[PDB]
Design a protein around this ligand. Structure first.
Ligand SMILES: CC(C)CCCCCCC[C@@H](C)CCC[C@@H](C)CCO[C@H](CO)COCC[C@@H](C)CCC[C@H](C)CCC[C@@H](C)CCCC(C)C
Ligand SMILES: CC(C)CCCCCCC[C@@H](C)CCC[C@@H](C)CCO[C@H](CO)COCC[C@@H](C)CCC[C@H](C)CCC[C@@H](C)CCCC(C)C
Ligand SMILES: CC(C)CCCCCCC[C@@H](C)CCC[C@@H](C)CCO[C@H](CO)COCC[C@@H](C)CCC[C@H](C)CCC[C@@H](C)CCCC(C)C
Ligand SMILES: CC(C)CCCCCCC[C@@H](C)CCC[C@@H](C)CCO[C@H](CO)COCC[C@@H](C)CCC[C@H](C)CCC[C@@H](C)CCCC(C)C
Ligand SMILES: CC(C)CCCCCCC[C@@H](C)CCC[C@@H](C)CCO[C@H](CO)COCC[C@@H](C)CCC[C@H](C)CCC[C@@H](C)CCCC(C)C
Ligand SMILES: CC(C)CCCCCCC[C@@H](C)CCC[C@@H](C)CCO[C@H](CO)COCC[C@@H](C)CCC[C@H](C)CCC[C@@H](C)CCCC(C)C
Ligand SMILES: CC(C)CCCCCCC[C@@H](C)CCC[C@@H](C)CCO[C@H](CO)COCC[C@@H](C)CCC[C@H](C)CCC[C@@H](C)CCCC(C)C
Ligand SMILES: CC(C)CCCCCCC[C@@H](C)CCC[C@@H](C)CCO[C@H](CO)COCC[C@@H](C)CCC[C@H](C)CCC[C@@H](C)CCCC(C)C
Ligand SMILES: CC(C)CCCCCCC[C@@H](C)CCC[C@@H](C)CCO[C@H](CO)COCC[C@@H](C)CCC[C@H](C)CCC[C@@H](C)CCCC(C)C
Ligand SMILES: CC(C)CCCCCCC[C@@H](C)CCC[C@@H](C)CCO[C@H](CO)COCC[C@@H](C)CCC[C@H](C)CCC[C@@H](C)CCCC(C)C
Ligand SMILES: CC(C)CCCCCCC[C@@H](C)CCC[C@@H](C)CCO[C@H](CO)COCC[C@@H](C)CCC[C@H](C)CCC[C@@H](C)CCCC(C)C
Ligand SMILES: CC(C)CCCCCCCCCCCC[C@H](C)CCCCCCCC(C)C
Ligand SMILES: CC(C)CCCCCCCCCCCC[C@H](C)CCCCCCCC(C)C
Ligand SMILES: CC(C)CCCCCCCCCCCC[C@H](C)CCCCCCCC(C)C
Ligand SMILES: *C/C=C(C)/C=C/C=C(C)/C=C/C1=C(C)CCCC1(C)C
Ligand SMILES: *C/C=C(C)/C=C/C=C(C)/C=C/C1=C(C)CCCC1(C)C
Ligand SMILES: *C/C=C(C)/C=C/C=C(C)/C=C/C1=C(C)CCCC1(C)C
Lengths: 222, 222, 222
């Protein structure tokens, strides 16, 4: 449309749609109960992202936020996506290593705090306070990355695949707070169309790329 | 009130209230842990519906949506109801057949997508796009109905009762997308007062009728 | 600020922050899987409350509701807090006594109804109807208190600690509907600044005080 960022929302829509169908077809035939879990979780993630990319594309998931005395376009639908997809991504890792339920609840809950405070920050009209919410959200993210690194007799296959996905996760997830900070939600150093591109690349890698690694491994089978 | 559809919201309120109290009293005394689950799930469903029918009745769960250059009355509270009650209904079926957790997560997640895209469609102001959301939601529903039919050594009692509830579910749930399509949320072929009547009949059958079948069966006991 | 109630939102923010860090440090080293669950649940509760107290403090979690022909300040963020923290509090009790899953689902669901109808009541613009929502919410609360009292061979340690926390819970939770009723959300008999103080004291006792009792007991260890 007249929104320069439309092309990246269109491409992301397409790529999440296509990954969803690919993982769907792939999980056809799986009867192993353990594998079943990894396919459900991993197929759902880009399915949800597909819907929220399309809602941004059609303009539904966009709102105007007054701050710095301007009307700032804020894509709120990203937070509806992440609210569900990031705990699912953490569940994939947690199941792989057979984490204790107490640790899974710590992780999902920290995650909810991360996304919910990011959303409040995105919609806050007092500019300086936006970054207070950014910092609390970032602290939640560092708690999560900590646990993925220092909170975990797995069969070798499990440990191998987990080490790769854990390294993927730390690198990609750590980039999101930076893009927000420099982008239209934060300091406004990078235009919205470039921000939208950055988040598209991170999202497709974190969802489809990550699932391609996981669903190709024997680590998911009993 | 001055809303011709009030009578059906009043009747639905009453019928969901009464079913909730009936199942409540009925589950008094049950000590079988397995039966306990079916009573909790099955009592909660019309309890939630009761509150959302009352919110429509009192006018709280109604908003105006501009589309086709008019102010269209949209009852959004239905989606708050269904967001919780339809996965619970699916949990009743899934527990009956002892489904794998991976399959339960596929089902609840597809369901969330179904209701959430229906809600976006209901609130979208660009008329043609309303039906794009309708179609994606419908695809999620067909995924769910598929799984209930081709994704499932149960004791005979389980298989019997499941076959009846599965047939009830496919027939009733399949009607909802049609009522939406022909009603005030969609093409506007049927007036709001008749739409509201249709949804009342489906809801009371899908919640109270369905629970009456289930809670009468020995299939729910270990 | 210019809001007389700010001081109590500031103190609550601080006290929830401090309890969160205290329980965090305390749970460092715990390896017992059962203890792990109680620490996760119990640390998360004031973590969430911290964020919602801060959102009230900064003004984000406040909205104006027209009723009785005035503009009534309503802190909606309390309901976002309670929606997650009160089922977690109930999960702490339920795990302690090893409740059946059917009973846990009854409890969490009744709780969701309690908070969600309280939220509708808080935002309803027709004054008399506010108290209809109050009454339904109160009925949900009485269902919950009933179950905590008449729905439950635990080792003595479990029974002891549970009896104390159950008595704490009944007394504190029962006060919330009274404060709402007499406060700015209800009859407007008590000013907002005094209401905010009352809820701060209840919240810090129900979250941090309650967790201090629980996390000090051996009841949480296998
Ligand atoms: C758990 C465990 C962890 C708990 C996390 C702690 C932090 C909780 C934060 C939450 C608070 C939510 C804030 C919010 C709901 C405020 C919305 O009002 C905005 C502010 O004026 C108005 O913007 C205009 C509109 C904006 C759009 C916001 C919509 C978003 C909705 C995304 C949610 C999804 C749910 C799917 C529903 C189907
Ligand atoms: C560790 C702590 C306890 C965590 C708490 C963090 C809270 C930080 C509060 C943010 C605040 C101090 C920054 C306020 C912006 C300030 C430089 C500019 C002052 O006024 C400006 C123009 O009058 C604001 O307009 C707008 C001009 C802009 C384009 C200014 C952009 C602001 C940027 C803020 C960047 C914060 C990241 C530095 C933090 C990295 C660590
Ligand atoms: C997409 C970004 C914008 C671009 C940044 C690309 C950097 C590439 C990351 C390399 C990392 C991958 C690790 C390779 C593997 C080796 C790790 O295995 C170790 C041995 O068991 C695990 O120990 C412990 C494992 C340690 C691994 C931690 C990885 C580091 C985390 C990187 C933080 C993020 C970067 C922030 C982006 C920037 C734009 C702000
Ligand atoms: C999971 C697994 C699956 C994830 C599903 C993928 C699709 C996600 C869609 C979600 C997005 C939610 C959209 C939304 C929150 C937008 C609201 O703004 C409206 C659009 O202008 C304004 O209408 C005016 C107001 C309208 C009213 C909307 C309110 C509704 C609230 C129902 C939710 C219930 C929660 C109970 C809270 C107590
Ligand atoms: C399988 C596909 C890939 C799935 C994707 C589906 C997307 C469908 C997009 C809907 C769109 C093509 C229909 C747009 C309405 C069109 C006939 C009328 C054109 O303009 C009208 C008046 O200028 C719109 O006003 C309003 C006049 C109205 C009363 C028109 C009502 C529209 C009706 C749409 C019905 C769609 C169901 C046919 C689909 C059943 C299959
Ligand atoms: C069938 C599958 C996807 C269908 C592909 C379509 C191709 C879109 O072509 C252009 C129509 O001029 C889209 O621009 C139209 C302007 C606007 C763009 C909105 C279209 C988007 C649709 C993306 C997929 C849709 C999904 C429909 C439901 C599906 C799951 C059955
Ligand atoms: C309420 C609606 C508006 C009115 C429509 C009423 C139609 C009555 C449905 C009959 C069906 C019940 C099946 C009877 C039983 C027999 C099935 O057992 C089979 C043997 O194990 C199961 O195999 C496989 C089982 C096969 C069963 C699939 C049932 C069909 C599903 C019907 C789709 C829906 C209709 C849409 C409504 C219309 C208004 C658009
Ligand atoms: C389950 C099991 C049990 C189901 C409970 C049954 C009762 C369901 C009730 C729910 C309905 C929600 C109502 C709502 C979403 C209506 C919002 O519109 C308001 C009314 O005009 C506008 O006020 C202006 C704005 C107001 C602010 C409301 C925001 C609140 C958000 C709190 C939710 C949190 C979620 C975290 C998201 C991150
Ligand atoms: C067990 C039942 C089935 C449960 C259902 C409960 C529904 C109760 C409906 C509330 C309604 C009858 C009270 C309406 C307020 C009424 C006294 C005042 C009439 O008009 C007033 C001024 O014209 C309203 O303005 C505002 C003046 C105010 C400051 C009046 C405050 C109202 C107070 C209501 C208190 C209700 C608690 C009594 C109930 C305790 C039991
Ligand atoms: C006691 C139980 C239900 C009480 C029945 C009441 C009967 C309503 O009579 C009319 C009052 O003139 C309702 O129209 C009044 C006009 C408006 C209608 C709103 C009333 C509705 C109330 C439906 C049930 C209420 C629930 C109260 C909480 C209950 C769970 C304790
Ligand atoms: C904070 C409020 C505003 C102030 C009210 C302070 C009252 C202090 C409550 C005392 C209670 C604590 C019980 C002590 C212990 C003994 C109980 O053990 C019993 C033997 O197994 C359990 O049987 C059965 C256990 C029975 C215990 C039920 C306790 C009662 C519940 C109190 C209802 C609430 C009060 C409402 C507050 C008022 C302001 C409206
Ligand atoms: C059959 C397999 C290989 C998957 C193909 C399904 C299609 C959709 C996504 C698959 C590709 C993505 C690889 C994961 C990692 C990346 C860093 C993706 C970032 C996007 C950049 C655009 C490059 C081209 C693409 C169209 C994939
Ligand atoms: C004790 C038993 C039989 C239950 C009675 C509790 C009351 C509430 C609901 C029970 C009746 C509903 C039967 C399920 C199926 C239906 C198709 C219901 C659709 C509604 C149509 C109105 C007909 C009359 C009613 C008042 C039940
Ligand atoms: C190390 C221990 C004792 C905990 C201290 C951590 C700090 C935060 C909360 C701890 C104190 C609260 C006790 C629980 C019960 C109460 C009734 C609290 C209500 C608040 C009243 C204010 C009194 C002083 C306070 C600053 C704690
Ligand atoms: C599918 C997408 C994923 C994996 C997205 C992850 C998003 C985050 C890790 C976002 C984190 C943020 C913060 C740490 C700071 C505040 C802003 C956020 C929400 C972008
Ligand atoms: C208690 C009520 C139940 C069982 C309701 C079920 C509702 C659905 C199956 C609704 C489905 C819809 C679609 C498939 C298309 C878009 C519109 C919806 C949300 C009505
Ligand atoms: C951390 C805070 C807790 C334990 C809060 C509990 C809040 C309740 C028990 C609130 C109950 C209410 C009703 C019973 C009636 C309507 C108003 C409410 C929501 C305050």
């Amino acid at each position: 449309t007249g929104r320069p960022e439309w092309i990246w929302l269109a491409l992301g829509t397409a790529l999440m749609g296509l990954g969803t169908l690919y993982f769907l077809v792939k999980g056809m035939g799986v009867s192993d109960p353990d594998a079943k879990k990894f396919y459900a979780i991993t197929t759902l993630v880009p399915a949800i992202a597909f819907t929220m990319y399309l809602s941004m594309l059609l303009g539904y998931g966009l709102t105007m936020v007054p701050f710095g005395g301007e009307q700032n376009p804020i894509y709120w639908a990203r937070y509806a996506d992440w609210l569900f997809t990031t705990p699912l991504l953490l569940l994939d890792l947690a199941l792989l290593v057979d984490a204790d339920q107490g640790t899974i609840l710590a992780l999902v809950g920290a995650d909810g705090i991360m996304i919910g405070t990011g959303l409040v920050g995105a919609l806050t009209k007092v500019y300086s306070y936006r970054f207070v919410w950014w910092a609390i959200s970032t602290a939640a993210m560092l708690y999560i990355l900590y646990v993925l690194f220092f909170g975990f007799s797995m069969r070798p296959e499990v440990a191998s695949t987990f080490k790769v996905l854990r390294n993927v996760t730390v690198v990609l997830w750590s980039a999101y707070p930076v893009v927000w900070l420099i982008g239209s939600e934060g300091a406004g150093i990078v235009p919205l169309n470039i921000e939208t591109l950055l988040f598209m690349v991170l999202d497709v890698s974190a969802k489809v790329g990550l699932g391609l690694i996981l669903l190709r491994s024997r680590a998911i089978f009993g």
